[PDB]
């Protein structure tokens, strides 16, 4: 026999995706997976969550606008991250207010009920709800990728603030264009579908091809490149930090060797201290604009002069030559040390801020991605138990091979709708 769709729930209208394989089948406006009372609880649950996520993302949008400036371009992609999730939080508010008015149409009364989900872009007031949610969701993800690009550029490649700012047109072209390139593809083959839990249109809910390729794949690709640049940035700054650490150790042994010479006598320990200072000066010079290493060259040359005058049996003159190093030491290298103490000031202020922001955005997203892959591995089974559990009231579809029982758990979908909104409140901890 095969698969069948009942005479009830027939569209005869704007065809889109074929439900359960057969053409012109479509799903009902009552979702009938969690029927009766708890569907309306989920409607109030989405409205409850959408208020709090509106009050933590739009609240930031008016907060960054008080200063506007003073947040540099390696602070910038988050102001457009929150704008992108300002829209996304508000469309779920639109879905709560409307209910089931334009998320699906009641159609005509030629058939029994006529309540069916709209598919495709044949009807207005639903493709608009796809345009502003999906485009500003994919943008919100890639702006986070841009923020990891800017973090890697400013911590791994040692780019300045203005050098990255020169590429602001290039970042906006990708971050508004790559979701813009995708949001015009979906309109071409009208893979947009409706919704019933939250009255907003989105893609990949009732299909296995749209969610896997155009929703699951781009977030997983954006996460993979995001962690790759973040892990590259954290390891480049960790190594930078080691150069400053051992250069400061060389400066410390230089300093306390000068101290132990300047309060001692005899011609024995002065040579031993000069040996250690020469080793430290060579190490600091090779650690490493040309004026700094030129100053190191003059420094180790004066160390050489002190060694020459100390091997001749002179102590007080060697002491004066040793204390003469401060004049060429303070005015040549110490300025660069304060510069590194003013520009490396500290990227941990960004490292902590990106670490917290990525930390409170990834684990809701991985949980959200976890439910996407949970939907993908079980949607085929979920549809076949639905058609078998309700084969009594309708004309009996597919009595053959109708032996499967895996009821979906309600504690998974509202988590997916939760984690779709909790990702947007991660910008309040930045401000």
């Amino acid at each position, epitope marked *: 026999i095969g698969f069948w769709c009942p005479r009830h729930l027939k569209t005869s209208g704007g065809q889109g995706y074929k439900f359960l394989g057969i053409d012109q089948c479509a799903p009902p406006c009552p979702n009938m997976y969690f029927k009766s009372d708890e569907l309306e609880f989920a409607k109030s649950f989405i409205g409850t969550v959408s208020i709090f996520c509106l009050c933590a993302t739009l609240f930031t949008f008016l907060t960054f606008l008080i200063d506007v400036r003073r947040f540099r371009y390696p602070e910038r992609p988050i102001i457009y991250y929150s704008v992108c999730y300002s829209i996304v939080s508000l469309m779920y508010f639109i879905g709560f207010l409307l209910g089931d008015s334009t998320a699906c149409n009641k159609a005509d009364e030629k058939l029994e009920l006529g309540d069916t989900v709209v598919l495709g872009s044949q009807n207005k007031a639903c493709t608009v709800l796809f345009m502003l949610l999906y485009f500003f969701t994919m943008a919100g993800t890639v702006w986070w990728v841009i923020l990891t690009i800017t973090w890697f550029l400013a911590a791994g490649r040692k780019w300045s603030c203005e050098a990255i700012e020169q590429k602001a047109v290039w970042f906006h072209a990708v971050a508004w264009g790559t979701p813009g390139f995708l949001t015009v593809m979906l309109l071409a083959m009208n893979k947009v579908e409706g919704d019933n839990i939250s009255g907003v249109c989105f893609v990949g809910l009732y299909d296995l091809d749209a969610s896997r390729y155009f929703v699951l794949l781009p977030l997983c690709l954006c996460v993979f490149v995001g962690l790759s640049l973040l892990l590259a940035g954290i390891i480049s700054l960790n190594h930078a930090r080691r150069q400053l650490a051992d250069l400061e150790d060389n400066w410390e042994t230089l300093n306390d060797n000068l101290k132990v010479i300047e309060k001692a006598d005899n011609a024995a320990q002065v040579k031993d201290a000069l040996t250690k200072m020469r080793a430290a000066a060579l190490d600091a010079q090779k650690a490493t604009m040309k004026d700094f290493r030129h100053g190191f060259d003059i420094l180790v040359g004066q160390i050489d002069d002190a*060694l020459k005058l100390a091997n001749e049996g002179k102590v007080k003159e060697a002491q004066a030559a040793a204390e003469q190093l401060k004049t060429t030491r303070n005015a040549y290298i110490q300025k660069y040390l304060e510069r590194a103490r003013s520009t490396l000031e500290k990227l941990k202020k960004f490292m902590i801020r990106i670490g917290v922001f990525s930390g409170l955005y990834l684990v809701p997203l991985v949980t959200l991605l976890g439910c996407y892959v949970y939907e993908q591995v079980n949607r085929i089974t979920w549809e076949i138990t639905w058609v078998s559990d309700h084969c009594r009231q309708y004309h009996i579809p597919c009595p053959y091979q109708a032996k499967a029982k895996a009821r979906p758990e309600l504690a998974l979908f509202m988590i997916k709708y939760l984690m779709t909104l909790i990702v947007g409140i991660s910008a309040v901890f930045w401000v």
Partner: antibody, heavy 124, light 109 residues
Framework: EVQLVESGGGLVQPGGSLRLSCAAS????????LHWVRQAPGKGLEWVAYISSSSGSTSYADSVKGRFTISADTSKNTAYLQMNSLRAEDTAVYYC?????????????????WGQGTLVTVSS | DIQMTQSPSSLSASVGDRVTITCRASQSVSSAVAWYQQKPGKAPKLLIYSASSLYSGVPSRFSGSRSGTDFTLTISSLQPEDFATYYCQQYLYYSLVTFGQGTKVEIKR
């Protein structure tokens, strides 16, 4: 081509005197520092002395301090290194080496060009 | 004063094998060590300077490494001409020259 040659090796009495000459053809003695490395027969290399003709920077090893001496001149472009009170443990071969001046690559290069070396022996 | 210790005083590798030589310094000398090659009866010839750089004239099989106070000369390809004594020299100052004991490389059979 720049070369270093040594002369003066032979047989001397213990406690006597001996003069060794290292002639540098090509590069001058003022643009480089001339060192002397001694290798005992069947043992490893050990360092003896160096001279810097730019200002005068003579120095010697601890085992030969106050006993050996070294000199160099630019007019003849050679280095002289004399023996005073030779002991029996000084029988070895003496190599003449060249080391550059700080700063830059010449200092970071160690002894690049070595002499042939002359063998000395104490004759008891 | 700056003692240099060369533990593998005699290596034995066949032609085409791997040769590694390890040199250890008493003090934390900077990346200023020199590796030499002395055939029996001839003057030493420089191989590696500045503890990592390769001298012009010698083959590229020689390598120079430094990790802290440890220095390593590695000869990955052993030609029949690389049968000589190799010496480790730190050079921090003109009058602080100290050589190692030296390692003999002989044919394995």
């Amino acid at each position: 081509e720049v070369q270093l040659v040594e002369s003066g090796g032979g047989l001397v009495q213990p406690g006597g005197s001996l003069r060794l000459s290292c002639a540098a053809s090509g590069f001058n003695v003022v643009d480089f520092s001339l060192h002397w490395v001694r290798q005992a027969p069947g043992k490893g290399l050990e360092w003896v002395a160096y001279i810097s003709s730019s200002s005068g920077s003579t120095s010697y090893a601890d085992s030969v301090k106050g006993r050996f001496t070294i000199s160099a001149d630019t007019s003849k472009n050679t280095a002289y290194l004399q023996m005073n009170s030779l002991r029996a443990e000084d029988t070895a071969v003496y190599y003449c080496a060249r080391w550059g001046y700080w700063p830059g690559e010449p200092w970071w290069k160690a002894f690049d060009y070595w002499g042939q070396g002359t063998l000395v022996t104490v004759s008891s | 004063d700056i003692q240099m210790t060369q533990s593998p005083s005699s290596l034995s590798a066949s032609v085409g094998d791997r040769v590694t030589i390890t040199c250890r310094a008493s003090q934390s000398v900077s990346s200023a060590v020199a590796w030499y090659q002395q055939k029996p009866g001839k003057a030493p010839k420089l191989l590696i300077y500045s503890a990592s750089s390769l001298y012009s004239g010698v083959p590229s099989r020689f390598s120079g490494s430094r990790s802290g106070t440890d220095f390593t000369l590695t000869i990955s390809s052993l030609q029949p001409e690389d049968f000589a004594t190799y010496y480790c020299q730190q050079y921090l100052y003109y009058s602080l020259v100290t050589f190692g004991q030296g390692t003999k490389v002989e044919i394995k059979r």
